[PDB]
Amino acid sequence: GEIAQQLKEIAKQLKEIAWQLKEIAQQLK
Amino acid sequence: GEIAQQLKEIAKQLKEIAWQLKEIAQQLK
Amino acid sequence: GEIAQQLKEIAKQLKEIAWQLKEIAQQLK
Amino acid sequence: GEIAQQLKEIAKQLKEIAWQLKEIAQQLK
Amino acid sequence: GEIAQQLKEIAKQLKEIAWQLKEIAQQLK
Amino acid sequence: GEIAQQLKEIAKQLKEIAWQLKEIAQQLK
């Protein structure tokens, strides 16, 4: 459903957010 | 409908959050 | 519905988060 | 009911996230 | 329900995110 | 089912976000 599809997109963006925060952590180190 | 539309907006804002975090990461690099 | 109303509030806060991260990026630059 | 209550709590935490990011931005400024 | 249980976990993680951002703000100060 | 599974993935990514923010906080400390 349309709900599920949007939640999938939300998950995708959160994965990218996680990735960028890992990059930030690495840079600060 | 309405729930899907709000989830779409949530996904849009998360995409912008991901973008800004990438900018921050790039600046630290 | 009540679900939709809370999702709308969630979207609002995510927009503010996006805005503040843009401000942070600008400050680091 | 219960879904609305959890979304309300999600909105509350996102508001706190927005607040803390504003604090970080203000500190960088 | 299963939806409610996952939203509860989402709220929990957002609370931790809020806490860590407060810690970050305190450290920058 | 499918909505629960996507919310589970959303919770998983938020847990990773919380973890990375803790790393950032620890680095600032």
Side-chain angles (χ1 to χ4, degrees), chain A residues 1 3-28, chain B residues 1 3-14 16-21 23-29, chain C residues 1 3-28, chain D residues 1 3-14 16-21 23-29, chain E residues 1 3-28, chain F residues 1 3-14 16-21 23-29:
Chain A
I3 305 322
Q5 285 188 344
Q6 293 307 325
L7 289 176
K8 200 170 221 305
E9 181 70 26
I10 286 166
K12 164 181 155 35
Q13 298 302 331
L14 288 168
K15 192 174 193 80
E16 180 64 13
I17 289 163
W19 175 265
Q20 294 301 334
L21 287 167
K22 178 170 200 268
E23 290 294 305
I24 288 169
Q26 283 181 13
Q27 292 323 129
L28 288 177
Chain B
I3 287 167
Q5 177 49 73
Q6 295 302 321
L7 290 176
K8 189 162 191 264
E9 184 69 32
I10 290 169
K12 180 182 192 298
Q13 299 302 331
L14 285 165
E16 181 68 18
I17 292 166
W19 180 272
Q20 295 302 330
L21 287 168
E23 292 306 296
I24 291 165
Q26 281 186 11
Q27 284 182 225
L28 297 185
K29 289 172 185 161
Chain C
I3 305 322
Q5 285 188 344
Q6 293 307 325
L7 289 176
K8 200 170 221 305
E9 181 70 26
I10 286 166
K12 164 181 155 35
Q13 298 302 331
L14 288 168
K15 192 174 193 80
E16 180 64 13
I17 289 163
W19 175 265
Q20 294 301 334
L21 287 167
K22 178 170 200 268
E23 290 294 305
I24 288 169
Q26 283 181 13
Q27 292 323 129
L28 288 177
Chain D
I3 287 167
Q5 177 49 73
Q6 295 302 321
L7 290 176
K8 189 162 191 264
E9 184 69 32
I10 290 169
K12 180 182 192 298
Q13 299 302 331
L14 285 165
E16 181 68 18
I17 292 166
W19 180 272
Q20 295 302 330
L21 287 168
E23 292 306 296
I24 291 165
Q26 281 186 11
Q27 284 182 225
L28 297 185
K29 289 172 185 161
Chain E
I3 305 322
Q5 285 188 344
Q6 293 307 325
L7 289 176
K8 200 170 221 305
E9 181 70 26
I10 286 166
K12 164 181 155 35
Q13 298 302 331
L14 288 168
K15 192 174 193 80
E16 180 64 13
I17 289 163
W19 175 265
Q20 294 301 334
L21 287 167
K22 178 170 200 268
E23 290 294 305
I24 288 169
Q26 283 181 13
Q27 292 323 129
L28 288 177
Chain F
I3 287 167
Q5 177 49 73
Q6 295 302 321
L7 290 176
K8 189 162 191 264
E9 184 69 32
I10 290 169
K12 180 182 192 298
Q13 299 302 331
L14 285 165
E16 181 68 18
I17 292 166
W19 180 272
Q20 295 302 330
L21 287 168
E23 292 306 296
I24 291 165
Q26 281 186 11
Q27 284 182 225
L28 297 185
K29 289 172 185 161

